Design an enzyme around this catalytic site. Structure first.
Site, PDB file in Angstrom:
ATOM      1  CG  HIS A   1      -0.442   0.311   2.505  1.00  0.00           C
ATOM      2  ND1 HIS A   1      -0.118  -0.676   3.412  1.00  0.00           N
ATOM      3  CD2 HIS A   1      -0.154   1.488   3.112  1.00  0.00           C
ATOM      4  CE1 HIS A   1       0.341  -0.120   4.520  1.00  0.00           C
ATOM      5  NE2 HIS A   1       0.329   1.192   4.363  1.00  0.00           N
TER       6      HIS A   1
ATOM      7  CG  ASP B   1       0.061  -4.047   2.811  1.00  0.00           C
ATOM      8  OD1 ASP B   1       0.565  -3.580   1.766  1.00  0.00           O
ATOM      9  OD2 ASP B   1      -0.298  -3.341   3.778  1.00  0.00           O
TER      10      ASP B   1
ATOM     11  N   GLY C   1       2.606   6.452   8.607  1.00  0.00           N
ATOM     12  CA  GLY C   1       4.001   6.811   8.419  1.00  0.00           C
ATOM     13  C   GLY C   1       4.914   5.671   8.832  1.00  0.00           C
TER      14      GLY C   1
ATOM     15  CB  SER D   1       2.637   2.138   6.162  1.00  0.00           C
ATOM     16  OG  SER D   1       1.398   2.490   6.739  1.00  0.00           O
ATOM     17  N   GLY D   2       4.826  -0.247   6.150  1.00  0.00           N
ATOM     18  CA  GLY D   2       5.920  -0.845   5.410  1.00  0.00           C
ATOM     19  C   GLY D   2       7.159  -1.127   6.230  1.00  0.00           C
TER      20      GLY D   2
END
Ligand SMILES: [Ca+2]
Length: 240
Positions: free
Chosen positions: A45, A93, A186, A188-189
């Site tokens: 995402h 994801d 922020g 994320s990942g």
């Protein structure tokens, strides 16, 4: 990271900052993990929007030169074939980014250790989430890398009605949920580092939190379970 503390300058050398170009400046948007000198693992995402991305390794403070940063462009983006932007709860994801050039490894830049395929952590396993994400729900990004202790919540409990229910899958890892500490926009990942056999390994890729807020009781932060994608990761890196 909500409820976190500032991380030591060289505690998490595999952490990277994924940034996009906004006009004539760059802005942090997601975290990631350096897994090869020229490959980065992050959330799918994070790269749904078609922007120009760059990766920063050896970063600690986003707003000032630390004299240890390396800036590299992203040459190719490989998102998992089953990823569906409209159904993050479906899982998958995860994305791999091939860097334009290999970064140099040193005390501030190291490869993240990946778990063995299929590894599942026991409930309440010790892990830390790191990132420059919001420090409060609807707050602002952190200037310096933050870390927060987020023990895991096994699938049985996380998929129970009192927690996430059917929204969470076995291909995910849950951590936190104490209503005080959690990942936030922020982050994320980014990585979920868990201590296994005396070594910190990256068991998760930050995926999502509740729509109600970042730190919500019984709504732990949800991560993509890295160990469920080892074959996929190896197939991509060895192929591309
Ligand atoms: Ca800096």
């Amino acid at each position: 990271v909500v409820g976190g503390t500032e991380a030591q300058r060289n505690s998490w050398p595999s952490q990277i900052s994924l940034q996009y170009r906004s006009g004539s400046s760059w802005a942090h948007t997601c975290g990631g993990t350096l897994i090869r000198q020229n490959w980065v693992m992050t959330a799918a995402h994070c790269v749904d929007r078609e922007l120009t991305f760059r990766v920063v390794v050896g970063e600690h403070n986003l707003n000032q030169n630390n004299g240890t940063e390396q800036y590299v462009g992203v040459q190719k983006i490989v998102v998992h074939p089953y990823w569906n932007t409209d159904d993050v709860a479906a899982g998958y994801d995860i994305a791999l980014l091939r860097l334009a050039q290999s970064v140099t490894l040193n005390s501030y830049v190291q490869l993240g250790v990946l778990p063995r395929a299929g590894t599942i952590l026991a409930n309440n396993s010790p892990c830390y989430i790191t990132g420059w994400g919001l420090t409060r729900t609807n707050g602002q990004l952190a200037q310096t890398l933050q870390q927060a202790y987020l023990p895991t919540v096994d699938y049985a409990i996380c998929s129970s009605s009192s927690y996430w229910g059917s929204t969470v899958k076995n291909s995910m890892v849950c951590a936190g949920g104490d209503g005080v500490r959690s990942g936030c926009q922020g982050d994320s990942g980014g990585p979920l580092h868990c201590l296994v056999n005396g070594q910190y390994a990256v068991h998760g890729v930050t995926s999502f939190v509740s729509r109600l807020g970042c730190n919500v009781t019984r709504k732990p932060t949800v991560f993509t379970r890295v160990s469920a994608y080892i074959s996929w990761i190896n197939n991509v890196i060895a192929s591309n």
